[PDB]
Symmetry: C3
Amino acid sequence: SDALHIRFPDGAVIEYEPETSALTVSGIKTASVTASGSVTATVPVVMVKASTRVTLDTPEVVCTNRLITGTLEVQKGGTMRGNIEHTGGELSSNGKVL
Amino acid sequence: SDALHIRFPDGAVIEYEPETSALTVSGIKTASVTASGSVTATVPVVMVKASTRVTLDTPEVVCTNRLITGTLEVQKGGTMRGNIEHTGGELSSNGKVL
Amino acid sequence: GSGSDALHIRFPDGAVIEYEPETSALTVSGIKTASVTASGSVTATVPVVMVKASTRVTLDTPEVVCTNRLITGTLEVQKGGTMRGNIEHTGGELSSNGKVL
Ligand SMILES: CCCCCCCCCCCCCCCCCCCC(=O)O[C@H](COC(=O)CCCCCCCCCCCCCC)COP(=O)(O)OCCN
């Protein structure tokens, strides 16, 4: 083919717009992608806007460079290498400030 | 169009069901999206079930609120701001339990 | 048989949306933006997920949950947190409010 605009009876749309080179899927309830090898996205900016939660259910999540978070909870321990600088509050272990 | 059930000769299927508003992609080995600008997903729940690994290969991963993990490995240092509460084990640095 | 359908769309901007049954590869290329908007959930189930983003990946959500291990190059925690279990620091200095501990 050379065009893609599908509008479904529930109001969902799957479309590709060449004028702005924009692929859109909208108005759906669920999507599920099952693959036996890999799923890859290669693009400068990825935005995941999830009003409930993003779950990465995997043995390993790897962030290759920087990871920034508002708050952190580590449930079962870990390791830190390099310089770790804490500021702007109290660092405590088993109820004892350091 | 207004319907979608594509059944490929390798057993893969791409389909949309408007009564449940469900988009399904199944039976594939790999998927990839390559874009020059951005990829966005807007949905309350994002679920990634990756039996080997999820890699976020990027200068920066930003979690805008809370991040929860089982275990943590920081390879090249970092900064922590605010109150940091350690409990339920030993916090050690360069071999010494604080 | 398993099916006889095909998917190969080449658009005037050079984008391609196709499925290649020879390698079972679904490919979208040559686009500028993609967006998926859903009211319930999106699931991907696959051994390997690779997100190769030369600027940034933002997870704009109340909570990101990594069910097992999280590995990062550097870490920046902006507004506090909790760490449970054994935490081992090596290979540098852990400093709090200016004091090397
Ligand atoms: C935490 C972040 C990391 C994990 C989550 C993000 C992962 C990012 C990478 C995802 C890669 C999977 C998606 C591959 C491309 C799918 C879309 C191309 C296929 C396509 O448009 O086919 C049309 C039907 O719609 C379709 O086939 C629509 C299928 C859409 C599948 C994707 C559903 C959402 C899954 C989550 C990933 C989405 C990321 C954003 C793209 C064909 O139409 P036709 O044959 O009738 O045309 C003929 C004329 N009419």
